[PDB]
């Protein structure tokens, strides 16, 4: 399948999907459903892949792509001065929030009532810096009414990092030590657990997903760590 549908108690007024590498037209190293236009692929192929995926996902409009910079800024999708941001927020029907990834954690959010949605691109830098709390801060609803879906990311068996990454996280939130295990001179990091921690700090505990690994599941996902020059997937959410 070209896409995954989040397994969460999705409100009737919300739609969401997350793409795989399967079912497009690109050739290696972008094989096949590469959505990224700035990673060296044949641009005709990328355009075709986007057409295929947007049709498969029944997107009502084109996604509002961001100029992702591995920061913590959120674009409120008001209908831009700048799209330099790593998350977006919408309360407008038909507006599609999207983040593009190939290892960095996508997080999709909505409220139980189905009146607000958001998408965050939470690579370790952005996650550490507070992109998830920034995104949550945009919601009008109460925190216990926010649902968060952890999309396909590089998982804890493959995401090896140096001690400086562990230090960066622990400097914000000491609990972060629980999300690393030592491997020689490095650490294996659980980005999912880090997300759960940082969201729990802001009262968001209804968390779903977190069961995939972009690195390990190579027939299903692109992985920057695995392949360096490769394609991108994306995660999408909208109010119907």
UniProtKB/Swiss-Prot annotation:
Zn(2+) binds at residues 70, 104, 121. The keyword ATP-binding does not apply. Disulfide bonds: none annotated. One of its GO terms (biological process) is peptidoglycan metabolic process. One of its GO terms (molecular function) is purine-nucleoside phosphorylase activity. Pfam families: Cu-oxidase_4. Disruption phenotype: Cells lacking this gene are more sensitive to ampicillin, cephradine and cefoxitin than wild-type. One of its GO terms (cellular component) is cytosol. Keywords: Copper, Hydrolase, Metal-binding, Oxidoreductase, Transferase, Zinc. Optimum temperature is 44 degrees Celsius. Maintains more than 80% activity at 50 degrees Celsius. It catalyses: adenosine + phosphate = alpha-D-ribose 1-phosphate + adenine; S-methyl-5'-thioadenosine + phosphate = 5-(methylsulfanyl)-alpha-D-ribose 1-phosphate + adenine; inosine + phosphate = alpha-D-ribose 1-phosphate + hypoxanthine; adenosine + H2O + H(+) = inosine + NH4(+). Its EC number is 2.4.2.1, 3.5.4.4, 1.10.3.-, 2.4.2.28. Homodimer. Purine nucleoside enzyme that catalyzes the phosphorolysis of adenosine and inosine nucleosides, yielding D-ribose 1-phosphate and the respective free bases, adenine and hypoxanthine. Also catalyzes the phosphorolysis of S-methyl-5'-thioadenosine into adenine and S-methyl-5-thio-alpha-D-ribose 1-phosphate. Also has adenosine deaminase activity. May also act as a polyphenol oxidase: able to oxidize syringaldazine and 2,2'-azino-bis(3-ethylbenzthiazoline-6-sulfonic acid) (ABTS) in vitro. Belongs to the purine nucleoside phosphorylase YfiH/LACC1 family. This is Purine nucleoside phosphorylase YfiH. It comes from Escherichia coli (strain K12). The lineage of its organism: Bacteria, Pseudomonadati, Pseudomonadota, Gammaproteobacteria, Enterobacterales. The gene is yfiH.
